């Protein structure tokens, strides 16, 4: 965190454990980290904690509750158009703070804990300095786009690919989070 951006991933639940928890809606496991790898019974993506709220894509979470040690938790915010949903951040998670330097040199953190450089090219668009196959970005929706100082700039939303390789990425800028909260 801060200086050079480095990240690591840790799996905490298996297929059967996830299914039971999805249905019971009660997760007793300990939470740590800024980005949580989450899954429904149909897909797996990421959710990032920014300023005390666990945000992710509505495309992934839809309008579902998040399993917690106290039972399922209702979302705090939902914005179909902005493609956002947020729940109170899990107890144990650590939050990122929005970027306050307008850097155009972003870093996308994928579900494999890789941080790949992205050059901002339009408020909600950035180009991959090193194109990766689309399969590499799958599962990373809801993940963070960081500024060199480790502050959230946006949440990964869509891949701009052709012939199966992603050249660019569309993301939800933090400003929309504040707008969704205010709306």
């Amino acid at each position: 965190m801060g200086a050079p951006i480095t990240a690591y991933a840790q799996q905490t639940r298996g297929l059967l454990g996830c299914i039971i928890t999805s249905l019971t809606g009660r997760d007793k496991n300990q939470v740590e980290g800024e980005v949580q790898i989450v899954s429904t019974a149909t897909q797996t993506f990421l959710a990032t904690c920014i300023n005390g709220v666990c945000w992710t894509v509505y495309h992934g979470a839809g309008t579902r509750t998040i399993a917690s040690p106290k039972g399922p938790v209702i979302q705090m915010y939902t914005n179909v158009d902005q493609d956002l949903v947020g729940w109170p951040a899990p107890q144990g998670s650590r939050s990122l703070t929005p970027c306050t330097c307008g850097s155009s040199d972003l870093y996308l953190v994928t579900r494999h804990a890789d941080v790949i450089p992205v050059r901002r090219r339009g408020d909600s668009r950035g180009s991959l300095l090193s194109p990766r196959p689309i399969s590499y970005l799958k599962g990373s929706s809801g993940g963070p786009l960081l500024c060199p100082a480790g502050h959230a700039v946006g949440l990964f939303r869509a891949a701009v690919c052709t012939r199966g390789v992603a050249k660019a990425v569309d993301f939800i800028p933090v400003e929309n989070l504040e707008t969704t909260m205010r709306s």
Binding site: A7, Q10, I37, R64, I66
Partner: peptide, 22 residues
Amino acid sequence: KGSVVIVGRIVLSGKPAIIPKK
């Protein structure tokens, strides 16, 4: 409908460290 379940975490707050021998 089923709840969204946390199945792992990505940690950005870690700093380089000498892997303890154990």
